[PDB]
């Protein structure tokens, strides 16, 4: 979108990139295309490498106590860029323009993503947690190696994002119908759930049309619709945990042998969901305001399991019915229907 | 398709067309291009118009007798005689027919707008002896002094859709359920082979079910459902099962099963059934089940007529701890004729 630079401490290696965000489509991931500008006197008789790193990070910064920092590399790849051996391969329009502008000391790099990688997802801390941080982030590091024996001064690092957008074509209209049976009763309780579409945007309302046809003597006390964020953490073992994001309930109760068809609109927002621990968010560039994490789309039929933070969404409708032992005691019937919460295509 | 003619009863107007079927590509509909041969002695001082008409029709004959309903969903007409100046843009078909027939041929072009249905009829029951319903298209050329019936000539045409070049995503539907006592879930997932299927082509329905409840899934049943939308004065719906298959396998508590069942929706298995949507006929010939209607996205006017869509319904019979619970989810697909 716009060309940005970062110069190393010793001013030996300068890195150039065209964009911060790199879009993961299901079929293919957008490659990291860029150039490095070197000072030939400063890089005389040393090798320069450009690396791409995907890291699972845990920060902890307690005042007066300790500073513990944890890191696990899910991906690491590097290509040599200096000294040049022959001509470079296929170059992008961005790379060709930048070599043309800067000069002869400019050298291109291309780092690619495989199929088994997550996206830039961070986890929200509580006000109980002052220095705690958790998330998956992507890094490009250009470094020189004076091998007369890695200097920190020659190395220059820059944060990037692997992002997913909403697909060109929408999925099926997500809908489910259920007919439940009780202790001895011949008559059933029927529930039908329907959403307006498969994919919703951040801030967009979700019209959940719910159609309950109660034909029993049982009274439906309240009907509750809730947006559930399914957060999956994969590292050594796969760990699923569910959190409620947005919730609304109808004012009307459903009578015995009577039906109700009501549509309920739910808006999931981070502005309503602040201060809660473990809420998955879309990864920041540098300390800016963010939203709730986008739905992760994984490539089908891949060999290796995807590690990191994987985010799923679902509409749950809960029905409290008057169960056994009378009207005073109650039991639950539920339906879960998944959906995608995603950013629009630019 | 070859060139065909129909002559007026008084032999005043002869209409020529190159084809009967006109393809509704979603972005633009194929226009009706033709010519009209006229007799100048019989048409001296008269005005000739060629019209295109879309009509919803209903017929009733003999129970206790005659009733016919008609709604013109579309009407447009163009004047051809007497000619004022020169013709506009002409197709190669129009130019070839003007040269071959001579001086008294006049071209017509009648275009379709975006909001129109396709040629869809409805199948009657065995007992329904004189009952017929459907949306049909008409081309009519007529002379005007007051319009005589003898001077007019009418000719049936079809608005048809074929399967698009670009196919949509692989159709997937997931749903989970929690029962009355147990907080344990039952998850059902459905996947299809294709987004678009052809007439006669088998549909592989891959059903995946993971049981965590204390309850047993007795039978798994898959249905091909024809959804028929009749729009005139209000939007009305009815759903009819076309093809049905059930698997012999049952799913126990704390178990998982993935099964793939094959269904072939055909009219041959669905004859003698009332309300079944069918692709419109030319004249009494054998047809198939109606093709899935594709409507242009973001159009201003509501589409009237008979609109046909297809869906895969899978329902699981879940036995309790009197009668068993049923849980179901739906997934759409398209059933269409292939590209010529």
From Swiss-Prot, chain B:
InterPro entries: Arrestin (IPR000698), Arrestin-like_C (IPR014752), Arrestin-like_N (IPR011021), Arrestin_C-like (IPR011022), Arrestin_CS (IPR017864), Arrestin_N (IPR014753), Ig_E-set (IPR014756). Keywords: Acetylation, Cell projection, Membrane, Phosphoprotein. The modification Phosphothreonine is found at residue 213. Detected in retina, in rod photoreceptor cells (at protein level). Signal peptide: none annotated. One of its GO terms (cellular component) is photoreceptor inner segment. One of its GO terms (molecular function) is identical protein binding. Changing residue 158 to E: Strongly increases affinity for RHO by breaking the interaction with D-279. Abolishes oligomerization. No effect on affinity for RHO. GO terms for biological process: G protein-coupled receptor internalization; response to light stimulus; signal transduction. Changing residue 180 to A: Abrogates tetramerization, reduces dimerization, does not affect binding to microtubules and to phosphorylated light-activated rhodopsin. Pfam families: Arrestin_C (PF02752), Arrestin_N (PF00339). Transmembrane segments: none annotated. The keyword Transcription does not apply. The keyword DNA damage does not apply. Changing residue 279 to R: Strongly increases affinity for RHO by breaking the interaction with R-158. No effect on affinity for RHO. Binds to photoactivated, phosphorylated RHO and terminates RHO signaling via G-proteins by competing with G-proteins for the same binding site on RHO. May play a role in preventing light-dependent degeneration of retinal photoreceptor cells. Monomer. Homodimer. Homotetramer. Self-association is cooperative. Isoform A and isoform B interact with RHO (via phosphorylated C-terminus). The C-terminus of isoform A interferes with binding to non-phosphorylated RHO. Interaction with phosphorylated RHO triggers displacement of the C-terminus and leads to a conformation change that mediates high-affinity RHO binding. Isoform B is C-terminally truncated and is therefore already in the optimal conformation for RHO binding. Belongs to the arrestin family. This is S-arrestin. It comes from Bos taurus. The lineage of its organism: Eukaryota, Metazoa, Chordata, Craniata, Vertebrata. The gene is SAG.
């Amino acid at each position: 979108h716009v060309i940005f630079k970062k110069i190393s401490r010793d001013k030996s290696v300068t890195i150039y990139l065209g964009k911060r965000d790199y879009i993961d489509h299901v079929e293919r991931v957008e490659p990291v295309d860029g150039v490095v500008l070197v000072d030939p006197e400063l890089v005389k008789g040393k090798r320069v490498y450009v690396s791409l790193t995907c890291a699972f990070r845990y920060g902890q910064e307690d005042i007066d106590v300790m500073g513990l920092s944890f890191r696990r590399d899910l991906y690491f790849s590097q290509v040599q860029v200096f000294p040049p051996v022959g001509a470079s391969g296929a170059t992008t329009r961005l790379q060709e323009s930048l070599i043309k502008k800067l000069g002869a000391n400019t050298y291109p790099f291309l780092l690619t993503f495989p199929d088994y990688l997550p996206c830039s997802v961070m986890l929200q801390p509580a006000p109980q947690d002052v220095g705690k941080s958790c998330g998956v982030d992507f890094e490009i590091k250009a470094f020189a190696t004076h091998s007369t024996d890695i200097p920190k001064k020659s190395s220059v690092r820059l944060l990037i994002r692997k992002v997913q957008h909403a697909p060109r074509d929408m999925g099926p209209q997500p809908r489910a119908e259920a007919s439940w049976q009780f202790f001895m009763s011949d008559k059933p309780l029927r529930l039908a759930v329907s959403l307006s579409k498969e994919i919703y945007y951040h801030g967009e309302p979700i019209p959940v049309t719910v159609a309950v046809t109660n034909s029993t003597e049982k009274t439906v006390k309240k009907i509750k619709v809730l947006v559930e964020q399914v957060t999956n953490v994969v590292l050594y073992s796969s760990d699923y945990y569910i959190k409620t994001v947005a919730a609304e309930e109808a004012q009307e109760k459903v009578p015995p042998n009577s039906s109700l068809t009501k549509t309920l609109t739910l808006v999931p927002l981070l502005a309503n969901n602040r201060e809660r621990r473990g809420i998955a968010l879309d990864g920041k560039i540098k300390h800016e305001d963010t939203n709730l994490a986008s739905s992760t789309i994984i490539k089908e039929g891949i060999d290796k399991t995807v590690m990191g933070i994987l985010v799923s969404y679902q509409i749950k409708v809960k029905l409290t019915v008057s169960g056994l032992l009378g009207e005073l005691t109650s039991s639950e019937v539920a339906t879960e229907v998944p959906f995608r919460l995603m950013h629009p295509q630019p």
